[PDB]
Every structure is written in C-alpha cells, then in structure tokens.
Amino acid sequence: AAAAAAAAAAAAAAAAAAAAAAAAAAAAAAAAAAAAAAAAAAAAAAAAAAAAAAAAAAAAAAAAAAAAAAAAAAAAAAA
Amino acid sequence: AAAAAAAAAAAAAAAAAAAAAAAAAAAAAAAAAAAAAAAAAAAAAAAAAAAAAAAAAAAAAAAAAAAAA
Amino acid sequence: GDLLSKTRRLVGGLATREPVWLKAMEASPPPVFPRSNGKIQKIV
Amino acid sequence: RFQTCRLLSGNVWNRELTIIQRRILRRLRNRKRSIKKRKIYPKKYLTSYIQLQTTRKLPFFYGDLPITEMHRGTKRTSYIPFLLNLETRFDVIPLRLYFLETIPQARQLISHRRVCVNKGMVSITHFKLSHGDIISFQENNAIIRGEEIRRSFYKEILVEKIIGKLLHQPLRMWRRSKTEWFHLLKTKRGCRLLLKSRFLQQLRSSMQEEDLERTKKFGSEKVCLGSSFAEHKRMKRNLLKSLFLSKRRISPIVYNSSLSLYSNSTYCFASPHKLTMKRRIKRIELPTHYLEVNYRTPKAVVFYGPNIGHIPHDIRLKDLNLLLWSR
Amino acid sequence: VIQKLLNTGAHLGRRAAEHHFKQYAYGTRNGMTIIDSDKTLICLRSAAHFVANLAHMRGNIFFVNTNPLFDEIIELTSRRIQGDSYNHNRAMNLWKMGGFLTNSYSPKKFRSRHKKLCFGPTTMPDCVVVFDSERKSSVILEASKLQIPVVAIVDPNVPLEFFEKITYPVPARDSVKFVYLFCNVITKCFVAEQM
Amino acid sequence: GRRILNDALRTIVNAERRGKASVELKPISTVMSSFLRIMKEKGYIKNFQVYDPHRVGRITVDLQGRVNDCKALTYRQDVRAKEIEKYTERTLPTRQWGYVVITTPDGILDHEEAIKRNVGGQVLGFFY
C-alpha cells in the first residue's frame, strides 16, 4: 500500500493522542467531582496514566463508532 | 512510504528523546489540572487551595529526595 | 513486613530503588493455603 | 555588639561595619562558619550546639530578655510564648516591625515618651494588645518621626539598597563616595518624585524576573506545564500531522514556524533554574497580618494576630524546626 | 486433572514424615505422607508464572544444585536457555561453596589452578531457583539477607528458619522415584516465551 | 470476674499465636459466650459455635488470626458511664483503640455501645 501507510499512521496518531488525553481528562473529572481529595488525587491520576483508564474510553469511542454507523447506514438505506 | 518510514523513525527519535530526556510530567499533570479546574471560587475554593497545598508536598519532597542526585 | 509486602512498602515510601523482580513477584503471588491445625489424619 | 556576632560565628546585625570589621567578618564568616557548619559530622551534640546558637540569636533580636526563661515560665517547650510575645510586647515587636530599632531606641520610648493607644498612653513596655487596638504617636513625636520614618523608608530602603546590588563587587570604598553623591541627591524633595518616576522601572522588571527564578525553583514550570498540557501536544500535532499530510505521504515555512515555536515551547517550559547567582539582597516583609499605618502621621491600628511562617527570622527553617517543631 | 493423574504416577505426593508443615498432607500411610498434589500443581503454577514474567524483563536467574542426580536433567538447561551461559553452567557444576552472593565481589584471585576450577563469577541474580536437600544453605541465608526471592523444593524436612524466609516453595517432595524429569516444565518456560 | 474466663481468653490467644485455626473449650459460660460474640461482630474471630446449652459444657471457636491479647479481668471493679472516657485510656494503645468491655443490666456492652446508651456496670476485658 505504497504512499498510503503514513496516512493510516497519522490517523492512528491523532486518534490515539486525543483518545488517551480525553480518557485521563474524564478520569480526573470524575475524581475531582467526587473527592480526588488530597493524595488519592495523585493516586487516581497516575493510575489513569499508568494503569489504563483509557481502554474503557476507547471502547466507548468504538461503541460510538458502531452506533453512529448503524444510524447513518439505516438512514441512508431509508434514502 | 519508506521515505515516510525514515521520517517516522525521525519522529520516534524526537518522541523517545523528549520522553526519556525532557518530559517532567508524572504528577504535575494532575496538580495543574486541578489548579486550572480551580478557575473560580465557591465553597470548593478553600477545599481546592488546601488540596493543592497538601498535594504539592508529595511532588516537592518526592522529586528532591527521590533519585538522580 | 513480609518478604512480599515489606519490599512494596519500602519502594513506595521510597527507601531504595525498585528491584527487577517486583512486577512479576506481585503478578505471581505465593501459593497460600487455609491455615489448618495439627492432626495429620491417618488415611486408610 | 559585634563581639556577639564573632561568638555566634556570623553576623548579628551590627550597624556600620568599619573596615577592619569588614575584614574580620569575611574571615570569620567564611573560614569558621564554613568549616564548622560545612562538613564535620560531630558527636559534639550538634543538636545542642544548634540549640545554643538559636537561643543566642533570638535575644538580641528581641533586645536583651532571656528567652530560655520565657520557655521555662510555661511548662511547654516553645512556639506559644513565641506567638504570644510576637502577638505583641508592644515596643520591641510592633514599633520595630513598622519603623524603629527594637533596641533601647524603641525601648525607653515607652518609658518616657508616649505612644498613646486609643489615645491612651500605655507606658509599661511589655503590653500585649490585639484585636482592635489603635497605635498612635504623640504630635511632638510626629513632628520629628515623620521625617525620621521618611529618611528610613528611603535612605535605608532606597538609598542603601540601590548603592547595593550595583556599584559593588570591585570596590566598596567606592560605593562609599557613591553614597555621598546619592545623599546629596536625596537631600532634594523634587529628586524624590523624579526618582519615583526614574528607571527603577527597569530594576523592578529585573526583580520580577529574579522572583520568577526563585519561583521556578520548585516546580512553577511543572504546574505551567500541567496547566498547558494540551498546547504543547497541539503544537506537536501541528508539526507531525502537517508533515504526514503535506509531504512524505506553505510546507517549508510551516516547518519553520512549527520548529521555532515548538522548540521554544519546550525550552520555556523546561528551563531548570540556572541560578549561579552572585549574592541575594533581602526584602523588608511588611506586616499585613497587622494593619498598615496612616504613614503620614502614625495611626496604625492593628486588626489581627500573627502567624508563624511570616516572621523576620535570621535563622533558616532549620534549627527553628528544632526550636519550634512546626510544619 | 489428568496432570494430577500424572503427578500421582510420578511417585511424588508421598514422602516420609519429617515435617514442620501440615497445610499440605492429605493423610499418611506409615512410611509415607501424602501431600495435596493439587497444591503442588498450584505452587508450580505460581512460581513458573513468576519466572516466565521475570523473563519479560530478562533478569539473571542462576539456578543452584549440589546433588548430582538431576545433573543431566538440569544441564539440558541454563546453557543456551535461561542464563544461557554453559561456562557459567560449569561454575554451577562446581559452585555454591565459598564467599557467596554477598561478598561476591571478593578477590578470590589465588588460583594455583592445579586440578581445581575456581570460577568466581559476579552479578546480582534477581531471583534464585534451587533444588537439593541442605548443603546449599548459604544460598538461602544470603538470598533472605539481601532480599532476593527464591524458588526451592522443600520436603517435610525443612527447618522453620528456611521454610519461612523462602518465598515460593515448591513442595515437590522427591521420593521413591528419586530424581525424575521436572525441570522440563521450566524448560517449556522462558523459551517460546520471550517474544 | 471468674478464672475460667481468663482461661478461655488466654487459650484463644495462645492458639492464635501458635497458628492453629479451630479450638474447643470445655468449661463454658454465658458471660463467655456473650464475649466471644462481642469479639466476633467487632471482627476479631470467625465462628463461635457453642454446643451444649445446659449441663455439659462445650464450645468450638474457629478463629481468623487477628491480634487478640484480651486479658480477662479477675478483681471486680465498678464502671460508671461517664468514667470510661478516662478509664479506657489505660488500654495498651492508650489513644487509638481496643474495646474495654463493660457489663450492664441491659446486656454486656463494649465501651462504644456503653457511652452511647449512657449505662454502666463493671469492666471485664481488654482488646489488643
């Protein structure tokens, strides 16, 4: 797939960067909303960044992909 | 895309070099995320300032008495 | 502390730097069994 | 007295260090204070040595009362009579904290002269006053010490500091004559306003910079980083993805700007405290846990009591973590 | 299950009563004691996993043996496998003895290499794996000193001063079959593992 | 307080730090059954099945493995309700914890339940 591999490379790069960043964003958001109080803050945050806390975010993104694909496809098949 | 593969080896070079040389983010990320999310005042302003005071100690002491010197 | 948790508390309180067997040590705990009394039953 | 500084192996704030005193302090401070405090590890009760040094520093600071005796009066160790006498002993603490020499200059003042509180003379010299106390000189005190506090706030915070920080390193016998000249210039109540408006703007900018230095000391850059976590990643995204989009799939000046501003991002958010400094002058730490003065004519009612981390200690946090075992 | 059939065929669960532990014995048969072979297998699971994980950081291992009945079974390993050093495998052949594992950076310079070996290699083994009865005690002591984990075969015969400061005990109990292939399990491990 | 009580408690403690997990005590009692249960639902043990309600005497206690020194008092003494705040300072860890056990007319308490109900009685045991 000459001249086309770097394209998928950039797509994966952008998607992964945004995805993991939004992941830890949601993790620390849930924390700071509930307690994230004093040192449980550093605990949960570095857990989000070293432990995954991002695999579930990407699974929610893939769920969004499948659901919205189904919606757009059934719409276009209503045509 | 083998020229792009050489560029991507260059990109891996920039990335690994940045990380293992100048990354300085393991907990300052969390600390300042809270600092900015503290962009306003409420009955969660004293809570915020005290959480910042009592989570800056871990970073300061950890760094200055952890390693590398 | 025990040989498995002493070391964790040590490295966590940042006493010494990490050993090269820690991630695997925790990943394969030791085979504990229910604490039972004496009386090895004579089985027949 | 300077002899006490010689004993304390350092500088107990003798005034007007004559030339051979300059010599002897350089000798003593460097050689002795180093050699003892630098690398010894003695069993020579370094804890108790420190204890002596601090319990000897503090009494001159508060004139001449014995502070071991203050400790002993209560059955505690410390920090309570400290926060107390500093809540006020009413001449040695407040009159110096604002405008005087805590020594029998600021003493004997309450003995003979007056500083009426709530217009009430309190001539006891050891009063404790807090929570709503108006501190006011008399008028025949004012008609002199208005000028005295002006010549203090300027000759001793503008003039001396400004002949310091500059004109300094090669020759001090020269800062001598430069102080003569700037004395002739401060003689002038128009020079006052012109100096208020002079290039001190530049020195204040440089001071902002040096405070930024002592700030980056312990992670100001790390919190700047965390607070702008995306933005650098956004710059990297610009660079790498515009790379894998425009080419290898205006590009050259896209790379120009991306390189410049991105490398500058990383530089400014990871420059680690090149201190290397020659010396460090000291600020005057005015009390705003106590309320200010009508500096025009002294009317300086208090509004609150003091804390423990905002006190003029001539001692580092150590040895006072041995005296005041505080966080 | 079938593996339990195989262990039971392996003349292993049964061994005379010289015991300090009883968390293990299924019973006794007056000349043997029957340990819980499922616990045997579970211990193997844990420890073999631990070694196959330590692999994923490739930390030196340095087996130990002194009873040369396993010599051949073991020597099929530790050379081109695990540590990979056949020359060190020769140290192991004739080692455990001297100033050991804590004064490892000893001189030991004097050879006069007349019908002697005198290897003295030196590097921190991040885990230890032994199997013999008791002469090797120095390795256990010094590992417990310097916080090195150990895998060890323990029979009913083990004093508390070992049975409690050795982690990962494989209570295998070699018995009437004497030495039989075991190490071929750890041979499976670490090879076709490191990917 | 009796001495069969002290006996039950010390047999518990010694079996614990010996390392067995299930024991049996012959001379049983109501004040002892109550105390086993109190320890239980405060956490310190696992099951306390008493067997013979009358006339014989046998308990089988199966244990967790917590600290449990728990000396059982012998020489009686009063305890009001407002004196525990200072008297339960003479346990082993004076400040943090241990439950001085008190007996009441309203059932055998510990010092938390006591200072809540504002009832008194007499001390019986300690906890550490």
Place this chain on the structure above:
Amino acid sequence: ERDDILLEKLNAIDKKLEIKLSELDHTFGKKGKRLEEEIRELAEDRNALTEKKRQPLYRKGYDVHVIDVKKVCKVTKGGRVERYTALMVCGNYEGIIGYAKAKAETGQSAMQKAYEKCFQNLHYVERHEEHTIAHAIQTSYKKTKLYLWPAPTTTGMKAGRVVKTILLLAGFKNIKSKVIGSRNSYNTVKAVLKALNAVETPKDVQEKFGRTVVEK
C-alpha cells in the same frame, strides 16, 4: 553516566570472562605458558571488578540525608590492644531512618567506615501527620523498654538525647517518649527502631473491615 560506567566495567569483566574461560578450558598440557597470563589477567579482573562495590563509598551509595554518630573504645589484650567502635544514623526528615555499626582503629576512621554503610539496611517509618506518631505504644528490646505517646502539634519533642536525635530527623515534631530500664546507647538505638516499626497506623488497622474515621 552511571549505566555507562556500569556496562563499561561489564565490558572489562566480559573480556575477563572470555580469556580466563579460554585458559581454564585449556587444562591439558604444559603448565607455565598459560598460567603467566592467568595471573596477570586475573589480577586485572580483581582491580576492575572490585571497583563496582568500591563506588558506594563517596558519591553514590551516598544520598543527601543527614547522619549522626556514636563511638566507644573496645579492647583486646594480646598486649594492650585498643580499637574503636562507632555507630551512625541516617535520616531524611521524611522518615527513612536507618543506621549502621562498624569498627576501626581511630575515631574519624570509624566514623568514616560507617559513613558509607549507614545507607544500607534501611527501614521506613510512617510519620502520621508530618509532625507526630499514630498512637501510644510500648516496645522493649532485651532490657530496654520504650513508650511513645503523641502530642497535639504544639508541645514539641519531649525526649532524651539518643532518642531525640532519631525522632527529630525522622520527621516528628510532637512526640513525648519515655525510655526506661537500661540507659545504654546502642540499645536505645534499635530500641527506637524496634519501636517505631511497631506502630500500626489506621491504614494498617484496615486489616479487617471498617474505615477508621479520624474524628474530624
């Protein structure tokens, strides 16, 4: 640089392993013509290999905590032998406290000969709120006993000397403590160690159910 010199020393020792393995595996034949090189390169291996365990003496194998010292004068009587024993305690004000004990032939030499071993065999103490200890506790060595009671934040350290210079640079500020029995030194050390390591903080007491509140 640390890893650079480490693997570099490893290059040295690997050429050592190579040539000395070769020479060993040549057992068979005439003797001298290999043993000369044997002695040379093995002596070289010594000089190089011992420098790893040399390193801990000054620069690394040396953190930035602070240390304090003890010392006495033991004896042997072959003639009138005299030597010196000495103790050291490392602490970092956050609580990592460790110690060490070793002997030498003169004071500063013994102080030294421990000054680079205090940094091994480290035990980590858990100072509750950065100023004091978690509770009261008794703890005894052979015949020295010890009692630890906290104090609210403003009293200060009420302890002796050998115990003060440990609770100080462990990071405590408001402990009161009573050591009783033997008034010896090296038992108060290791008594403080057998004591502070005995405190079970609420994190510990969550060894069973129950989140233990602090009373706010």
Place this chain on the structure above:
Amino acid sequence: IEQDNRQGRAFVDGIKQRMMEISVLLKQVKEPGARGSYLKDSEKTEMYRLHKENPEVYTIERLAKDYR
C-alpha cells in the same frame, strides 16, 4: 490554512511568558490560603471613597469581597 491558524495559536502560546506569572500568583495564593496583592493604597482610598459616598449599598461585604 488550518496550518496558519495553527501557527497563529502556536505563536499565541509562544508569547505566553505571562502564564508563568499567573501561575506564580495562583501558587502563592495556594501557599498560606492568602491572596497575592498589596491593594497599593489606591484601592484603599478608592474603597473609602466608594463606601463614604455609598454607605447604603457598599456593605463591608461588597467592599471587602471586592478588594478581598
């Protein structure tokens, strides 16, 4: 053109020396639970003016929370 938007915002960040200083003041505010200012006495005579004229609206809550 997205690229030049990007370069504009990257320049925006590059000229953000000041963010170091807002972080300065906000961590100082962190330090003792206090606020990093003087009021410079212009605010003090200003608030005296404000309240003197308006001792009806400018409570010592309005005023003192204005000037913190």
Place this chain on the structure above:
Amino acid sequence: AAAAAAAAAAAAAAAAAAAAAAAAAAAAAA
C-alpha cells in the same frame, strides 16, 4: 524537504536536550 524538517526536529530537540543536560551538569557543581 519535509524529511529535512523531520531530521531538523530531531536535530533541534536533541540539541536542546543536550544543552539543558550540560546545564544541569554545571548547576550540580554549586
């Protein structure tokens, strides 16, 4: 050209890294 810019990024970034590394090596003296 863009490959020249990629290696240019590697160049400038490794340059900055080494410069600050030596900077710390010098700041460790005092």
